[PDB]
């Protein structure tokens, strides 16, 4: 028999290992990416980040 079936849920265009880059839109193509929203820390107080409240 060797029966086999696969199913993939819908997605915009998120890859994993690698994706083909468009010759017309190669600047959109990225090997790796993160969330589209960006934010920088400009408080100048010190700005510190921790893994969690109680990583210990």
UniProtKB/Swiss-Prot annotation:
GO CC terms, sorted: apoplast
Tissue specificity statement from the Swiss-Prot or TrEMBL entry: Expressed in leaves and flowers.
Localization annotation: Secreted
Keyword Lipoprotein: no
Role, per record: Cell signaling peptide that may regulate plant stress, growth, and development. Mediates a rapid alkalinization of extracellular space by mediating a transient increase in the cytoplasmic Ca(2+) concentration leading to a calcium-dependent signaling events through a cell surface receptor and a concomitant activation of some intracellular mitogen-activated protein kinases.
Name of the molecule in the record: Protein RALF-like 8
Keywords associated with the record: Disulfide bond, Hormone, Secreted, Signal
Disulfide bonds listed in the record: 21-29, 41-47
Family membership: Belongs to the plant rapid alkalinization factor (RALF) family.
Residues of the full protein shown: 27 to 82 of 82
Domain of life the protein comes from: Eukaryota
GO molecular function, one term: hormone activity
GO biological process assignments: calcium-mediated signaling; cell-cell signaling; positive regulation of cytosolic calcium ion concentration; regulation of root meristem growth
Organism encoding this protein: Arabidopsis thaliana (Mouse-ear cress)
Induction of synthesis: Slightly induced by abscisic acid (ABA) and accumulates during senescence.
């Amino acid at each position: 028999e060797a029966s086999v079936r696969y199913i993939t849920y819908p997605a915009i265009d998120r890859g994993d290992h690698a994706v083909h880059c468009d010759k017309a839109h190669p600047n959109t193509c990225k090997k790796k990416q993160a969330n589209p929203y960006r934010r920088g820390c400009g408080v100048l107080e010190g700005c510190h980040r921790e893994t969690g409240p109680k990583p210990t």
